[PDB]
């Protein structure tokens, strides 16, 4: 019916990845792949690999046809933040968050 | 509680609540405000009441 792929703990804030995710939500997978190929954003690379994985999952695991597949759901969730220190002036330290994201792509022929 | 009597930070100027002791009962790891001691719970019963 519907096939999933996820990239967990992707190194990018959810805010940045969601920009790209919004482009392909609802599209035919062929159109989606084109859109991602000509989006000049690091997130477009991340999302395209997940989408490609979802298509391969649908074909191999669920005997689906690539021609019929649409991106039926796509969402980005916040993953864990890695905490780092950034020295500032006058002996003060700031916290840096290295934000991560969980990218989920669901393709289906319906 | 184990720990020193050093004032954690100076009384004024830092913008923090004033602190005197790392062992304050307000603090995590601090003392218990009214720490129990071993107690004798026995009561007197008058012989005639027994």
């Amino acid at each position: 019916m519907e096939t999933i792929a996820k990239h967990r703990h992707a190194r990018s804030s959810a805010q940045k990845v969601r920009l790209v995710a919004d482009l392909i939500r609802g599209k035919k997978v062929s159109q989606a792949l084109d859109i991602l190929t000509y989006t000049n954003k690091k997130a477009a690379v991340l999302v395209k690999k997940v989408l490609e994985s979802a298509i391969a999952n649908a074909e191999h695991n669920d005997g689906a046809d690539i021609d019929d597949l649409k991106v039926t759901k796509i969402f980005v969730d916040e993953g864990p933040s890695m905490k780092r220190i950034m020295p500032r002036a006058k002996g003060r330290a700031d916290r840096i968050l290295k934000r991560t994201s969980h990218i989920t792509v669901v393709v289906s022929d319906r | 509680v184990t720990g020193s009597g050093k004032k954690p930070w100076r009384q004024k100027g830092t913008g923090r609540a004033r602190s005197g002791s790392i062992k304050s009962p307000i603090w995590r790891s601090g003392g218990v405000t009214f720490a129990a001691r071993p107690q004798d719970h026995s009561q007197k019963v008058n012989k005639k009441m027994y």
Binding site: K90, G91, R92, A93 | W9, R10, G13, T14
Partner: peptide, 16 residues
């Protein structure tokens, strides 16, 4: 007359 001293700095304290 002036009702305030001219602003001054505070001494450094371990920040966090």
């Amino acid at each position: 007359p002036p009702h305030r001293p001219r602003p001054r700095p505070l001494p450094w304290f371990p920040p966090r």
